[PDB]
């Protein structure tokens, strides 16, 4: 769901 690259939690 969220865009790459997404910082862990």
Known sequence: ???P???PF
Do not use: A, E
Request: charged share 35%.
């Open 1 to 3: 769901k969220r865009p």
């Open 5 to 7: 690259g997404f910082s």
